[PDB]
Amino acid sequence: SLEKQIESYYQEIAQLIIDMIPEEWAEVRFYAQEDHDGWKIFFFHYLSASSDEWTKDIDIRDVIKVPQDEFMEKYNELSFCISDFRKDYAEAFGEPWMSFQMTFYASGKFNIDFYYDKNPFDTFLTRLAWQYEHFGTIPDSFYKETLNEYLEEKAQGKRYPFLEPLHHH
Amino acid sequence: SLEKQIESYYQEIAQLIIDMIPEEWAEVRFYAQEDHDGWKIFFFHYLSASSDEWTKDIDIRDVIKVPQDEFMEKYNELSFCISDFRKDYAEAFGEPWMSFQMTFYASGKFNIDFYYDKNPFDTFLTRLAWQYEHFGTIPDSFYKETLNEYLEEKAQGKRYPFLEPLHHHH
Numbered sequence: 612s613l614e615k616q617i618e619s620y621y622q623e624i625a626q627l628i629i630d631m632i633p634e635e636w637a638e639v640r641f642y643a644q645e646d647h648d649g650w651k652i653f654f655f656h657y658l659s660a661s662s663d664e665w666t667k668d669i670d671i672r673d674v675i676k677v678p679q680d681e682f683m684e685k686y687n688e689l690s691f692c693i694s695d696f697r698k699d700y701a702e703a704f705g706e707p708w709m710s711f712q713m714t715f716y717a718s719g720k721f722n723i724d725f726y727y728d729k730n731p732f733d734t735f736l737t738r739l740a741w742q743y744e745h746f747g748t749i750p751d752s753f754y755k756e757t758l759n760e761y762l763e764e765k766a767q768g769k770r771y772p773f774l775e776p777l778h779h780h
Numbered sequence: 781s782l783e784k785q786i787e788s789y790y791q792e793i794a795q796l797i798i799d800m801i802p803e804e805w806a807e808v809r810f811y812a813q814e815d816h817d818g819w820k821i822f823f824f825h826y827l828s829a830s831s832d833e834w835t836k837d838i839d840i841r842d843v844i845k846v847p848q849d850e851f852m853e854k855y856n857e858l859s860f861c862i863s864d865f866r867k868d869y870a871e872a873f874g875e876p877w878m879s880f881q882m883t884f885y886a887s888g889k890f891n892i893d894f895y896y897d898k899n900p901f902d903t904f905l906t907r908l909a910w911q912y913e914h915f916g917t918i919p920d921s922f923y924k925e926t927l928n929e930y931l932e933e934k935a936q937g938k939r940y941p942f943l944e945p946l947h948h949h950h
Contacts, residue, residue, distance in 0.1 A: 649860045652853075669848045672841065678923075679838045684821075684903040690859060691818040734856075735849040754847075 613703070620696045621723055625715050627689040628655050631682055633671055635660035637717050642741055642774065643693045644710035644730055652734050653693055656742070660717070665746060667738075700725075710773045726773035736761055741774040782872070789865045790892060794884050796858040797824050800851060802843055804829035806886055811910055811943065812862045813879035813899055821903045822862055823910075829886070834915060836907075879942045895942035905930060910943040 628639055638658040645651045655668045675682060701707035708725040715721040732740060740761040742748040750758055765771075797808055805826045812822040824837045844851055870876035877894040884890040899906060909930040911917040919927060933940075 649864060651856050651860060653856075654849075654852075669852065678904045680823075680904040680907050683838065687820050687859065687903075690856070691820065694863075695818060733849075734853040735847045738849055 617723065620692070621713060621715070621721055624689065624692055624696075624713065625721070627685050627692060628657075630685045631668065631671060631689075632657050633674055633676060637663070639713075639715050640745060640776075641713040641715075642710070642737075643713075644737075644773070645694060645697050645707075646709060646729070647707070649694075651690070651693070652730070652737050653690065654734075654738055654741075656745075712773065714777075722777065724777075728771070728773055730771065730773065731764075732761065737774065740771065744771075744775045786869075789861070789868075790882065790890060793858065793861055793865075793882070794890070796854055796861060797826075797837075800824075800837065800840060800854050800858075801826050802840055802845075806832075808882075808884050809914060810882045810884075811879070811906075812881075813906075813942070814863060814866050814876075815878060815898070816876075818863075820859070820862065821899070821906050822859065823907055825911075825914075881942065881946060883946055891946050893946055897940070897942055899940070899942060901930060906943065909940065913940075913944045 624641065625639070628641060629636075632639070636657040637660050639655055640657075641653070641655040643651075643653040656665050657668075658665050672679065672682065697707045706727070709728055710726045710730065711723060712726075713721065713723045730737060736757055739750055739754060739758045742750065743758060743761070749755065761771075793810065793812075794808070797810060798805075801808070806829050807827040808824055809826075810822075810824040812820075814820045825834045826837075827834050841848060841851060866876050875896075878897055879895045879899065880892060881895075882890060882892040901909060905926055908917075908919065908923065908927045912927060912930070918924065930940075
């Protein structure tokens, strides 16, 4: 079924991410983006089982045990899998996704949603904005100022659902 | 012309690598490989202008002062340029290259070659073997035993021109 084919892409992507993660994890959230011209942003964060803290993909290289080239191999594999999936999805659906967000849990539960908007922000600010939406993080004065570029767009009523998560006073 | 269009790619790849380099440099050597199924290895080393030592691309991240995402952005752009070039080259000439090597210098001079062989080695061993061939580097006991896999093939007279640098003196 089409549903089983999506589960297989999710499984393949999740396994490459799991291969990069150097410790027991509780939850992973993955953001991927590719436009018609091949411009790409992708990154994951994972919740460490031992510390119960969210950890960025880019921070794994500070604690890495395997040769860096082994991690980069998996990184390249994940990048190709994003693009290969986009192409097959476009052939089947008639148009590509522009981005997707995936969440998966230690339980084996997962969520995937697809979006079709252009993202005006670069890699660095996209991650700051994604973190802000997903975790409320408000982050260093230079980083804070950069996050403000996103916050000032939001303040004018602009919204970027592709990087947002899914009555007391 | 075809010559100008292909030199455009070489210039674009060189500029993305330059954008990743954090200091004055004298020379860069670049290796890229992609097969029919999208399997990819690519890396560069550069020769520092001040120290006159070679530095691996993967070691720049220890010294950069900008956000790691800015480096990863450039990495991603370079990776896409490799694949976009391969696809265009295959369309135009009717078959893709399997790998290529480029050398460029601060002067803007460059040398390049294309290869059509399959590489049997993974990312880690490919870089060790490439370093061995270009610089004579022999590594650490685990890294040395890994490189032995490659040296065992050389001992049988096998050769991998795609990772060798681009006369009867003693």
